[PDB]
Swiss-Prot record, chains A, B:
Keywords: Calcium, Cell adhesion, Cell membrane, Cleavage on pair of basic residues, Disease variant, Ectodermal dysplasia, Glycoprotein, Hypotrichosis, Membrane, Metal-binding, Repeat, Sensory transduction, Signal, Transmembrane, Transmembrane helix, Vision. Residues 1-108, 109-213 form the Cadherin domain. GO terms for cellular component: adherens junction; catenin complex; cell junction; cytoplasm; plasma membrane. The chain holds residues 108 to 320 of 829 of the full protein. It comes from the Eukaryota. GO terms for molecular function: beta-catenin binding; cadherin binding; calcium ion binding. Glycans are attached at residue 93. This is Cadherin-3. Interacts with CDCP1 and CTNNB1. It comes from Homo sapiens (Human). It is found in: Cell membrane. Three calcium ions are usually bound at the interface of each cadherin domain and rigidify the connections, imparting a strong curvature to the full-length ectodomain.
Amino acid sequence: DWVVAPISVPENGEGPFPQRLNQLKSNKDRDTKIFYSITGPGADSPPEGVFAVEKETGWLLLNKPLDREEIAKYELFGHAVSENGASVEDPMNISIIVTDQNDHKPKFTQDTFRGSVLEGVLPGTSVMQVTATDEDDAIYTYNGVVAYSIHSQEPKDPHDLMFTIHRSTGTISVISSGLDREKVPEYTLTIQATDMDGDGSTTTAVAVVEILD
Amino acid sequence: DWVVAPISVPENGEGPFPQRLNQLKSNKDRDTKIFYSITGPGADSPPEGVFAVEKETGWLLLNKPLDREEIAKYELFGHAVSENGASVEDPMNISIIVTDQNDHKPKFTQDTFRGSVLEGVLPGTSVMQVTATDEDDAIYTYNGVVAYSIHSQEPKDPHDLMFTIHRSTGTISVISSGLDREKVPEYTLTIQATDMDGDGSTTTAVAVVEILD
Ligand SMILES: [Ca+2]
Ligand SMILES: [Ca+2]
Ligand SMILES: [Ca+2]
Ligand SMILES: [Ca+2]
C-alpha cells in the first residue's frame, strides 16, 4: 500500500509554530465528512501535544522545536472517523525522523585528568589519554566530532611546549627532551576540545602530568 | 484509502528547482526494491517534464515555475514497480493545485471607447461604460479585481473635470453642468484601471464622448 514516507524535521526549528508537516486524507471524503486524529508518543501520550492534527483538514502539525538528543524518532498513527462515528481506515503509520543540528558543545569526562611518565623516555612516547564527548551526531556530520588540542603549559621549563596531543584520539605524548623530576616534578596542561572537528565551539580542562623518577 | 492530499503550489516560484513536493512510498519496500514513476499531463505528456519523480527515493519534484493562467491544475498518477518488473500498487492519483499570484496587469478591452450624451442632461446621468480585464484571480484575492478611474480631461472647458467613473463598474457619468455641443462638441478622457482594487499596477486608455445636440 501507498503510505506516508517518514518525515524529516531538523531539530531546533525556528517556526513559526504550529508548523504544517503533512496533510492526511482518506478518499472516502467524497461521501462522508471525515474527522482525523493522531495517537502515539508525542501526540496523546508522553510527551503529549508535540504534534497535533487539524481534525477537519487532516493537516499534521508540529507545535514546537524538537531536540534530537531527547527524542530522535516518533512513531505516530493517523486515524480517520466518519461523522457517524465509524473508523473508515486502518490507522496509518506515521514516522518523524528528527535530524541533527550542532546544539551541544563538547564536554570533558573529567575537569582534571592525571597521568605520569618517566624522565628520559624518548620523544614520541605516549603519556596518558584524555577524553571529551559530544551529544550531537558524529556519523553524518562533524557536529559530534571532537578536535583535541593543548592551549598552554605550566611551567614553561625547560621548553615552552614539551607535550603534544593527538587531535583525534586525545593521547598526550612527549615531544621534547629535558624532563627531569628533580628540576620539574609536575606539569599542568590546559587542554581543549572543539566540535566540528576544530571549526566549532570549544571547551577546556586540565591534565596533570607527574614526572617519574 | 489513505491517499496523497492535493498539493498547493504558488505560481511563479523562485525555486530552487528541482523542488521537492512530496515523497511517494509503497510499504512493500520492506521486501523488494521499488521503482517509482509518474504519468499524466505535466509528466509524460504535454507539457512534458514539468514534474518528475526520483525513481528510487520516490520524491515528486517540480522542475520549473508554474503559471496558473496557463494551467491551474495537474492530475498525475504515481506508479510503483518491483525490481522484477511487476507493478505492486494501483496507480495513485496525485493533484497539483496552482495558486494565484498577481502576475497580470489589467488590460482594457479597447484602446478607445466611444460614447455619447445629450447636452443638458442632469448631473448624475450615465453616459457610457468602459471595461478592463485581469487574468488573475478575483475570487479569493484582489489580484484580478479592477479599480476604474479618470486621469484627466481634454478640453478643460468649461470645468476641469465634468465626468466621473464608477470605480467598480466603469460606467462614466456626467457630474457637472455646462455641456454644450456648440461650445465643446467632444471630450477625450484618459481613463485608467488598476488591479489589487487600486493598490496594484495600472493601465491606461481613452474614452471619447460626443456631445449631442
Ligand atoms: Ca556538538
Ligand atoms: Ca544535536
Ligand atoms: Ca492582476
Ligand atoms: Ca495570476
